[PDB]
Amino acid sequence: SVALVPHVGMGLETRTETWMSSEGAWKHAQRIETWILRHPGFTIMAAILAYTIGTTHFQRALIFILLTAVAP
Amino acid sequence: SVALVPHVGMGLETRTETWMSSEGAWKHAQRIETWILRHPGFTIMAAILAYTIGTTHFQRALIFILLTAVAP
Amino acid sequence: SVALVPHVGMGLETRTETWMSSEGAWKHAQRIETWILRHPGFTIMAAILAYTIGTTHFQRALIFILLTAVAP
Amino acid sequence: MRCIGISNRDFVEGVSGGSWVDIVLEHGSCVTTMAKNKPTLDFELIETEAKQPATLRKYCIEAKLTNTTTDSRCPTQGEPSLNEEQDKRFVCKHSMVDRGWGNGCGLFGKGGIVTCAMFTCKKNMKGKVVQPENLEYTIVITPHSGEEHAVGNDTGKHGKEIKITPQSSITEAELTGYGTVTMECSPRTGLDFNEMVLLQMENKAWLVHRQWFLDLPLPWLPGADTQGSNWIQKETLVTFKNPHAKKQDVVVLGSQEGAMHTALTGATEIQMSSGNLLFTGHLKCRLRMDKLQLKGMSYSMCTGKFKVVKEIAETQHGTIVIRVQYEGDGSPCKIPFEIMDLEKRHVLGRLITVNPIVTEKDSPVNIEAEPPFGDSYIIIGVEPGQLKLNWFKKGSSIGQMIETTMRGAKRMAILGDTAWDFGSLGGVFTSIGKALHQVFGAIYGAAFSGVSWIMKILIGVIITWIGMNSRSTSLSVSLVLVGVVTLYLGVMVQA
Amino acid sequence: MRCIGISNRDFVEGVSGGSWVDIVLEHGSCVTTMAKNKPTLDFELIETEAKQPATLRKYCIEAKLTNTTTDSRCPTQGEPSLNEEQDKRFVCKHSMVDRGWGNGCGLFGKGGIVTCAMFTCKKNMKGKVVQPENLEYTIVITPHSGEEHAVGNDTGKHGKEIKITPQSSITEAELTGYGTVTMECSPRTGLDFNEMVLLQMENKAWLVHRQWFLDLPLPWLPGADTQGSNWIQKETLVTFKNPHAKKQDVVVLGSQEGAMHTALTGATEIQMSSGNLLFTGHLKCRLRMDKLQLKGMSYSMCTGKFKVVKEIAETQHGTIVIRVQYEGDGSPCKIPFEIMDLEKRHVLGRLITVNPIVTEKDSPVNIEAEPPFGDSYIIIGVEPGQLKLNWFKKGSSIGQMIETTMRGAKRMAILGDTAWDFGSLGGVFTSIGKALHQVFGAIYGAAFSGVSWIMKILIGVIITWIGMNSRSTSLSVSLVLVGVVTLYLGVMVQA
Amino acid sequence: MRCIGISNRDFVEGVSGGSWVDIVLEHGSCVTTMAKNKPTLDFELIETEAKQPATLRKYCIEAKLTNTTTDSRCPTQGEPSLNEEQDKRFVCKHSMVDRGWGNGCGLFGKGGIVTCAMFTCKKNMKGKVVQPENLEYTIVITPHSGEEHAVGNDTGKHGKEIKITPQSSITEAELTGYGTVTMECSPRTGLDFNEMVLLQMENKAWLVHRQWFLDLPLPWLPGADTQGSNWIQKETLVTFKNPHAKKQDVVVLGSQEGAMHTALTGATEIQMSSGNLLFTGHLKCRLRMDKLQLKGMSYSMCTGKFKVVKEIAETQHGTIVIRVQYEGDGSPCKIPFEIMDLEKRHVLGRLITVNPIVTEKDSPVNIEAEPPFGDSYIIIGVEPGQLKLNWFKKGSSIGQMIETTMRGAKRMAILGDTAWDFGSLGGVFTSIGKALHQVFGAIYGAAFSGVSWIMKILIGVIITWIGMNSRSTSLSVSLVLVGVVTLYLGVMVQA
Ligand SMILES: *[C@@H]1O[C@H](CO)[C@@H](O[C@@H]2O[C@H](CO)[C@@H](O)[C@H](O)[C@H]2NC(C)=O)[C@H](O)[C@H]1NC(C)=O
Ligand SMILES: *[C@@H]1O[C@H](CO)[C@@H](O[C@@H]2O[C@H](CO)[C@@H](O)[C@H](O)[C@H]2NC(C)=O)[C@H](O)[C@H]1NC(C)=O
Ligand SMILES: *[C@@H]1O[C@H](CO)[C@@H](O[C@@H]2O[C@H](CO)[C@@H](O)[C@H](O)[C@H]2NC(C)=O)[C@H](O)[C@H]1NC(C)=O
Ligand SMILES: *[C@@H]1O[C@H](CO)[C@@H](O)[C@H](O)[C@H]1NC(C)=O
Ligand SMILES: *[C@@H]1O[C@H](CO)[C@@H](O)[C@H](O)[C@H]1NC(C)=O
Ligand SMILES: *[C@@H]1O[C@H](CO)[C@@H](O)[C@H](O)[C@H]1NC(C)=O
User: Fold this and answer.
1) Residue E40, helix vs strand vs coil
2) Nearest-angstrom CA–CA distance, E168 and E160
3) Whether F382 and F448 share a structural domain
4) CATH code, domain with E450
5) Neighbors of chain E with 3 or more C-beta pairs under 8 Å
6) Could you tell me the CATH number of the domain that includes residue F361?
7) CA D66–ligand 4 middle distance (angstroms)
8) Is E155 touching ligand 2 by the criterion CB < 6 Å?
9) How distant is the alpha carbon of residue F246 from its chain centre?
10) CB distance from D77 to chain F under 8 Å?
């Protein structure tokens, strides 16, 4: 809806603090761990799929973080 | 806000139509496509960084889609 | 409780004596040897576990002193 | 009756074992039951109702801050103290402002500050849980009598409405002319309450589940709370403004009525205005047809000159229906209805209005039957004055098993293991597939929860790509039941 | 003097040939300017006003639907149409339902249907726009005159207000004593309007990006408008409900206020209930200080007998402010202020309030200076009653260099190339380094746009990691300029 | 002369440079200053006082719970609610009890319960804080040439009692008959407040660390908090009894007063009664001996006939104190005091009471001096009646300079780098001796801060063992300053 596209990387930032800062600066990192801690099966399955695709460990951890981040 | 965690995969679905399917079933991909059509530099940078990492032709495309999808 | 955090190494210390020194300087050692006298079995077990790991004779006495003192 | 014209009608052919068959019926769909005797019936679940709900958690949707007071503290000495911090109506924040000589201090530094405002809720939202007991389904049975102007009308009193509860039993339903039906129904297993919450906004209501409803970012309050002033999660509906380093202020974050309708994309809407009326879900019935008379047995066969008064109309699923009228004597009689081929050799097709009957009158009757997939004569009389009616049916040869196959796969996509409950206890070939389907649905259900339309397609492409590029014959197990099935369940999702 | 205790101060030392220094002053900060033999001044922008706005586009926050009409046809008979579909204040949808004989139709298929509902707004959100013309800035010019009630005192007549408008941006300030001062401000190359929209909800206002404003999914209407009868995208705030393939319906989606407050994250709040008073952004100023006298040169020295009326009171950024009273003779006179040490006395410590004078003997005078990073002694009187005071200062040795480096790196992380306009005409180094910062700013821009707190840190570690593994000494590039700079910026994002 | 009998006496000679010398004096110690002329003085810090304090945080020691209420609720229907939970005097918690048909609800599950109790404080521990200004030190400057009954009496007025504030200056202090002594003291670098909290229990007080005081688990309260109801960390003094899965209860823990007296093992007791009197810490004085007369010049010598009235009485540090009484004619006169050997050819031994003098003949007078190790004779008077008294100072050796080395090493143990301030601008030994200590003190700081008596000895033994068995001659860098110094400081802590 309108609550998405949240006006973050638009430039226009000064040292005056913004509208909802230190409240929306960590909300994605809190809903992503609420979502992990209430859906463990997709995190495990994304660890198997992330461990399968990827030779080196860095791209395995990258595919794990990105696959865990695309799902809400 | 409350407008995220949008009650998508929970079970509980019947043959009866849910609250906003056909308006909340394509708007995510539409939001991503208009995001790319407004911000075309992160697509090129995600293509170069997705090409540099990923030493097969599949996980280059997988890392490209996932990096394109985590940035809103 | 506040029986812990005992204000020992806080700096701030001058030539005049503290609140209870020569009444709290040897209480820890007498306490951790009275605990040994009431509990020999952990001292034998920490001698064995201190003797298996610890290749050198300094790692053995160090791990024995540390494992003995870290159990109040 | 009541079911011709409704799409996704199911046909179940069986009375096997005793005289029972398991059926599973939803609110949108309908079920038609046939046998070698035991006349064809029609089943429609029309109503779920929860009787006495108990509220669980109330959420503040729109609020209002009143009586904003701030208190500042000069640096290096303590926190501010304001008397309204003691009351939990007031939302409070300690921030840290710049203070010097110019704003009434003695030292130059960064002193403390508090701001407080009384949080007043002014429009609510309440979710109510119910028990698996005291909820009453309403189901309509209607027989194929071929009554005049009874085809597909929801209005009108043609079928018996019976109401089933988990307090109920065998639940006899004496429907006249035909005998009785008993429906061994399992209402406790249908929609899985003690997991869902009957949410309620201003005039609408949804069917959301608990561990989505309990962890909402709105300020809430317990269900057993009169004088609803003590809101608990108030800091997610106000915001505090300390722009440069000067005074901080409070503002209400706004109204989440239209914001939470975005959160409900995936929830099925129910009707909590006058009673908790759920018009969604399914339930599993066991129909027992051991006491069904035929209503037309021991009537003498008819003797000629019928008359067509409504044209043959082809339904979806290819089952035509004709309304004819009888002229002649012996008015309680049967009807010589048969669909034969060209050359009139074999009797083809099947009747769905088993034992058609002229009910006592010069009033029309309705007959439903299915033709085969080519040309056919439809013959509605005896030889002096028959009615030969040509008919052609399109497709219906090899597309029928693929439509049946993918509606069975959609039936297994909407329902879970319960979709293995259209059969009459197949035993070693049905009752083991329900167990394999529920352990596969438990492994598949523990994964893939919380993901959407797009994500199941992406994971289906990934698992399919692992399967097409694997070894040791893990190709099959990695795509034929995991790779492709996830793609199909990703297309058929978001109903 | 208007500047003390604000925690963002940014001292400026020096001047370049012809006596002008190039500064950039912001709304949070207040710049202190120090020259060789010229009084030290204190500047702050305090008000940015947009004088006359023209509304660009009106969105609606909440609406309502009346006059619901519905029109259906037969299966094969085309598609419905009624005259509310051509009227552009009704919202409409074509769907498709089940038809049969029970609907009084025939042919047993799926027939089209339309639903129309009159759209009526009831809460608005007006996005106004201004041109870079008639955008008025207000800067106060407060000298370091040692004078009572002056240090952090942001009221009274301690400064002089000048007004930078882009058609005439020179407006020299004649202040009493100290001569005059001219400022060549460049307000067009600042915040870059014509691409920013002064958005306005009910009692709040934001300052949002223009292309961000023109692609919000919400029903809009042009700015120059009178009647609400042509809302363009009405489907973004209604929804159409077609369950069971029976009749469909339409409802309103709800009040979009708090969802928009979630959209307005990152936007800087302005206020436009009375005026259009912005309180964010910077302004580049060229400070020409040629006709700037000292107000107290060719006065004689004091005879002695000072007394302290307010103590030393160290500021953040490591300066001290003492307030002293004078008793003696010859009242227009110079304070013998020095910051010495003990025996074989060296001069260690710079004076900020340069040339402190006594005027109006029975009134205090507050002097500001800075000590070095240890013991230091303040000397005020001269032969009898020499007012020697101890003072100690913590840190300020090498940590002052890293605090200066973090002020320059934060100042370079907030401002763009304009951060290079903080010094007085470096010639080739400031111009070449600024030009390289415009190239690196234009390539770092049109990238990292729409990219948040987290994604810059992720995209910085996955370019630092591929920097450390690369060869041909590209490691000294992909770590330095794009690896850890984007990590640092990603920490400093969401200021 | 308020110096003989104190165990810590600290003789300092040399007024070199100009006529100044740095002395550092704490509360337990005295300081005796000598020179080539400029008579010998005795300095003792006697009192520190903090003038007006401001309280920082108020903890409670013992409390009281009344109005205990509770409210339980049936399973799966949410959390209970209670009107006392809205107030913050009431400590509350939620728990899970067993509930079934016996409790009167139903459903046989694990239910929710709340418990509330009003938390009233009744013993209060408040910790105050002061600024480094308005905090004065009281010093006593008592000169030698001891009259009737003044050897070590604190009682009586034999010297001046000047006060030093950081508001103050050169601090002139005129001595009656002597000249005028001035001290430029440093009361800001002395004890380093703003990390100090003047903690106050019922009748006692301590000087504790600030961050130690703020990290203290007890229910606290702001220093600016009138009507002390809103206690904050209340759950650290109450506890909740839920023994089985049945009802829970509240109980108070009890008086934490005796549990705080073990928290304070390592804090110095001050007395907060009729003022904030500190009796710990040191003070660095810049002693200046420009204007000092000897009080006894321009007199004649005696004519003989002394009489020893108090015996020889060796002070520890070997500085014997005799008391003689003169009988004669010219009453104001200089005493003929010498310390020579057996056959009186050499003068060996030093006089500390320099220029002894008889005033008011009918009053004994007492003289202090320093013999050498061994036999040394004391000659008082002239040839007709002089006193030749034996004294055998108990034979020492190198032992005196190993006691001096242990005394200065102990002074470096208590005082970190201020122990390098007994000299007079030493330069190439002293001014770098501070600096190389300050680099090593900030590294010894925060690497042994928080550890105790035992742990410094343990890390000392470890870090001298890993250096004792090392290579490349890191034996010196891991023994001579890191191992042995942490063993010595390990056995000198807990003063
Ligand atoms: C559904 O059934 C009702 C009830 O039988 C039908 O309504 C009847 O219609 C006939 C002819 O129009 C009237 O003579 C009756 O009086 C009506 N009965 C009632 C109770 O109103 C209705 O027409 C049927 N709907 C269909 C076939 O679409
Ligand atoms: C800021 O300055 C104004 C004037 O420049 C101060 O106002 C004066 O306050 C004194 C009290 O000390 C009054 O006697 C005067 O009459 C006031 N003058 C006015 C109102 O014009 C004001 O107190 C200063 N504020 C601070 C915080 O220093
Ligand atoms: C310390 O000094 C005081 C002050 O002189 C001494 O007090 C005197 O003691 C003599 C002894 O007989 C009395 O005659 C005086 O009257 C006292 N003076 C007073 C009380 O003001 C005191 O004795 C000295 N201390 C010692 C240990 O001798
Ligand atoms: C809020 O303000 C009104 C008047 O402004 C006052 O009467 C009322 O008591 C206040 N509420 C509280 C809780 O103090
Ligand atoms: C909408 O309904 C109202 C109700 O009275 C009435 O004005 C009319 O029927 C409709 N108005 C329109 C279509 O403008
Ligand atoms: C606590 O109980 C006493 C009973 O005597 C009652 O008077 C008092 O009002 C109660 N306190 C509160 C806060 O209700």
Assistant:
1) coil
2) 18
3) no
4) 1.20.1280.260
5) A, B, D, F
6) 2.60.40.350
7) 8
8) yes
9) 55
10) yes
The helix (H) or strand (E) run that includes residue F46 is strand F41-50
The torsion angles phi and psi of D446, rounded to 5 degrees, stand at -70, -40
Is residue F27 less than 8 Å (CB to CB) from chain C? Answer: yes
Distance from C-alpha of F86 to C-alpha of D232, rounded to nearest angstrom: 10
Pairing of strands E11-13, E31-34: parallel
Separation of first and last alpha carbons in chain D: 27
Task: Report the C-alpha gap between E240 and B20 in whole angstroms.
Answer: 8
F423 & F389 share domain = no
| Burial annotation E43-60 (CB, 10 A radius, 16+ → b, else e) | bbbebbbbeebebbbbbb
The reply to whether F359 and F420 lie within a common domain is: no
Q: Tell me the residue length of chain D.
A: 495
Atom index in ligand 2 nearest the CA of residue E149 equals: 28
The residue of A17, A44, A63, A68 whose CB has the most chain D CBs within 10 angstroms, and thus the best one to mutate to test that interface, is A17
Q: E478: nearest CA in chain B?
A: B49
Resolution stated for this PDB structure, in Å: 3.1
- Protein residues with CB under 6 Å of any ligand 1 atom: D 149-151, 153, 155-156; E 102, 104
Does D406 lie in the same domain as D385?
Answer: no
| CB within 8 Å of D157: residues ≥ 6 apart | none
d(CA D297, CA D401): 34
Residue D129 and residue D198 in contact, taking contact as beta carbons nearer than 8 Å: yes
Print burial letters for B2-32: b (CB count within 10 Å at least 16), e (below 16): bbbbbbbbbebbbbbbbbbbebbbebbeeeb
Enter the tokens of residue B70.
Answer: 């985590």
Locate B16 and state its tokens: 């009866």
Is D213 in contact with D226 (CB distance < 8 Å)? no
D314 contacts: CB under 8 Å, gap ≥ 6: D320, D393, E107, E108
Regarding the beta carbon of D67 and ligand 4, being less than 6 Å apart is answered: yes
Q: Could you give the maximum distance between any two Cα atoms of chain E, in Å? A: 119
Contact A59 B58 (CB under 8 A): no
Statement to judge: residues F425 and F474 lie in one domain? yes
Same domain, F407 and F342: no
Kindly state the DSSP code that residue E346 receives in the 8-state scheme.
-
Residue E434 and residue E366 share a domain: no
**Of D224, D225, D277, D276, which is closest to residue D52 (Cα–Cα)?**
D276
For ligand 5, say whether the CB of E7 is within 6 Å of any of its atoms: no
Measured between its terminal Cα atoms, the distance across chain F in Å is 27
Mark F108-130 as b/e (b = at least 16 C-beta within 10 Å). Answer: eeebbbbbbbbbebeeebbbbbb
Let me know: does E137 contact E247? Beta carbons within 8 Å: no
Residue B62: its chain A contacts at CB < 8 A? 53, 63
Contacts 24+ apart (CB under 8 A), A36-45: A36/A68, A38/D211, A38/D215, A38/D450, A39/A71, A39/D449, A39/D450, A41/D446, A41/D447, A41/D448, A41/D449, A42/A68, A42/A71, A42/D447, A42/D448, A42/D449, A42/D450, A42/D451, A43/A68, A44/D447, A45/D447, A45/D448, A45/D459
- Regarding whether F381 and F344 lie in a shared domain, the answer is yes
CB of E388 less than 8 A from some CB of F: yes
List strand residue ranges (DSSP E) for E41-165, in order.
Answer: 41-50, 54-72, 90-98, 110-129, 135-143, 160-164
Taking the alpha carbons at both ends of chain E, their separation in whole angstroms is: 28
Provide the domain limits for residue E440: 398-492
Q: How far is F398 from F395, CA to CA, in rounded Å?
A: 11
Q: Is the CB of F153 under 6 A from ligand 3?
A: yes
Method underlying the structure:
cryo-EM
Taking CA atoms only, the protein residue closest to ligand 6 atom 4 is F67
Query: Do residue D77 and residue F226 have CB atoms under 8 angstroms apart?
Result: no
What does each C-alpha distance from D100 to D94, E6, E14, E311, E407 come to in angstroms? 19, 8, 27, 13, 21
Tokens 């959209």 locate to E263
